[PDB]
Symmetry: C2
């Protein structure tokens, strides 16, 4: 009296994983239908998805792989099913037709339904709704919500999507925490006080002028004293208009406080003025003092600020750091480009990918919008949500969101843009969009 669940393994592996996890204990056999490789008809193989599905569902011998040789031909689909589908006399047959192409599902459904139509065998069809997180049974008016029922971690999620070599950091392994061992908290807290005091616009403006004019230029500018001295002497040619004078005389007190939270040996300032090295300073001395500090103030601080805000607002939500959220996600897949996500969040089985920038130039921001939209789609299916955080004003943020929404067919439940008016409250604004 065995009961069989049938899944169709296409290219989006997450729904089948959620449906298999929910129903694993109620079925004796699992039939995993997948597309074989066939270079003549240009049919790509989904066998590796099928293997990763069996592996992470822990199905073992209960799993029967059913290869289809030509998923574009109706007759070859039926002949392959008739030859290979398990012949046991089942008391229930459950086809979940969420995965696979339209053509496959149509004839996989019709074949199985008719096969048991006259054996008084309970037949069931279902699909997983990606907009509601519900398992919609075919002839039932009610659908069960799986959002708070199925939980998945970042390692498993990337595994079923065939990614290996997974690396991410969290609160304790964050890289710049190691570059400022005894200072990072003091530095993070000054910046956080500033942003939470609505100083984001003022910081970003100062960061462009005079900060970047002083500290960004040619390659290895901050690693060679001679380069940096020639850079500084040429800036002194602007006289009263020079970024040096701006730094010394027009830096707001909150930025002075941020500068002075760094250790003395890693400060861009020498007292209440710019530190300008002399000729005796070796390249090691210039690098040790300025390089890491400049890298952080040039934009890495915003990645930590937003992540620390999220982690705070998740303190009462039972998401585990290093499993359901993290920062700096890197992964790779065979014959595939390098995968990168600034911050990731998993809410149930909803992947939340966040891409961050302090910029307000539209071309840059729109590029990062396309990127994060496609990235989260690659490891989270249709259930996923992409969030882009920029330094644009309220109007420009809404236009970019509207433009990207209609251009990629993304609803707001699937793609949100935030701006500089949201930085002080980015923790609660992100969590509101996710846990709605």
């Amino acid at each position: 009296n065995e009961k069989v669940l049938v899944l169709i393994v296409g290219t989006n592996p997450l729904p089948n994983y959620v449906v298999g996890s929910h129903l694993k204990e109620k079925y004796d056999k699992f039939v995993l239908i997948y597309s074989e490789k066939n270079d003549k008809i240009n049919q790509n193989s989904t066998y590796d998805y099928a293997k990763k599905l069996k592996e992470h569902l822990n199905l073992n011998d209960k799993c029967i792989f059913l290869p289809l040789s030509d998923v574009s031909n109706s007759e070859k689909i039926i002949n392959d099913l008739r030859e290979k589908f398990p012949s046991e006399d089942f008391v229930e047959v459950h086809l979940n037709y969420t995965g696979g192409t339209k053509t496959m599902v149509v004839h996989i459904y019709n074949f199985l339904k008719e096969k048991f139509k006259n054996n008084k065998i309970k037949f069931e069809g279902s699909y997983l709704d990606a907009r509601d997180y519900k398992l919609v049974y075919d002839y039932s008016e009610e659908a069960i919500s799986l959002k708070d029922t199925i939980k998945i971690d970042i390692n498993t999620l990337l595994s079923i999507h065939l990614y290996e070599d997974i690396h991410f950091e969290f609160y304790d392994t964050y890289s710049y925490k190691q570059k400022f061992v005894d200072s990072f908290d003091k530095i993070s807290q000054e910046i956080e006080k500033a942003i939470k005091d609505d100083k984001g616009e003022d910081f970003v403006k100062w960061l462009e002028d005079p900060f970047r004019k002083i500290f960004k230029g040619e390659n290895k500018l901050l690693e060679k004293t001679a380069k940096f001295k020639k850079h500084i002497e040429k800036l002194l040619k602007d006289n009263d208009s020079s970024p040096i004078v701006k730094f010394n005389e027009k830096t707001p007190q909150f930025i002075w406080d941020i500068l002075n939270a760094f250790p003395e040996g890693k400060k861009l300032n020498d007292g209440q003025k710019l530190w300008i090295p002399d000729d005796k300073i070796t390249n090691d001395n210039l690098s040790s003092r300025v390089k890491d500090t400049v890298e952080f103030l040039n934009g890495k601080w915003f990645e930590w600020y937003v992540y620390s805000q999220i982690k705070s607002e998740l303190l009462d939500r039972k998401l585990k750091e290093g499993e359901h959220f993290g920062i700096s996600l890197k992964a790779q897949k065979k014959d595939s480009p390098y995968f990168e996500l600034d911050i990731f969040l998993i809410n149930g089985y909803q992947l939340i990918g966040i891409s961050l920038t302090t910029s307000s130039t539209r071309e840059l921001c729109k590029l990062k919008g396309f990127e994060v939209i496609h990235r989260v789609r690659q490891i989270g299916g249709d259930e996923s949500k992409a969030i882009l955080i920029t330094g644009m004003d309220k109007s420009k943020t809404e236009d970019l969101q509207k433009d990207l929404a209609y251009e990629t067919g993304s609803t707001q439940k699937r793609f949100v843009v935030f701006g500089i008016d949201d930085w002080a409250d980015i923790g609660s604004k992100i969590c509101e969009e996710v846990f709605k």
Copy 2:
């Protein structure tokens, strides 16, 4: 004794239009199944697509509209089909299930296949393959190629996607032919010789410096004499380092030829020197002189260059100007942002959009690649094809193509990128990629 063709009207109207065009004369009745508006379940209507499909196929009284109240629930689909579908005793029912969602098509197919299996009416099922342009019949081993059989023009293609306010240009109505009256031919030819002499890179590098540093700044820089004079005087202070000096003293000979092709009252030069207007020159004199010239030289020329190379290679082909190719396509959809394609080509029913830039900056090229890939899928379905033309070198060009094809799931024949080395014979390369 009639034969009825059944179509499913989702949001991708092109395949239904192609299949209907191919099968219209061989069928006597037509059932267009669509999603009706249902606000309780947030189900939008696809009737506007169905109505346009009936219009541009000229079905009239032979067309039967079949609304579906809940395309997400199998019971509702079956009951709406059992009630609304024609009850007449047909000799052949042909369901083409290319349109619609996967869940609808499952239950529409099984319902109809089992209705006419019991009644012993010939039932035919087919789908349209976007990869190979073939109508695949369910239990026939042969697919009919429609690649060289079905045709569509750009008005009908946009009209079935619900686009109105359609505007585009062709060889005779190109806008800049009027702004530089009686001289545009000389300007094009002068620019064409430069590119075909492989001076495109030198040209682009002179546009960045000094051209753009002189003519791009304030929003109305070229429309108010005081703004442009202020701007020139600020740069002129850069003795031995001014863009004005570089313009006057380091401009290659071939660019002087380009600048001197413009009419007298449209020239940026005053002899061998930059034209610096004095205070008595009016805003309308400055704007009349440089504004159109600057927009054309700043990048519009490249759109015309490529377009004219394509038109030269498309002579005596099935493509016709204003029907199957044009330049500067603008269309507007209700409650939607404006649609824009630099160049469009329709080969059969394959929409080929082209986005152009002379930039070699990867960030800007990657953005334009994203945009054109999504745009052709908006008005061209999975049959469409996107081409990006950059000023990048050979290796970065092929890297960007590989990178963007993966992120967007595009075949190497459905997203093509060209670079600076391709400029001279761009028309030959484009027509090779198009007709292959």
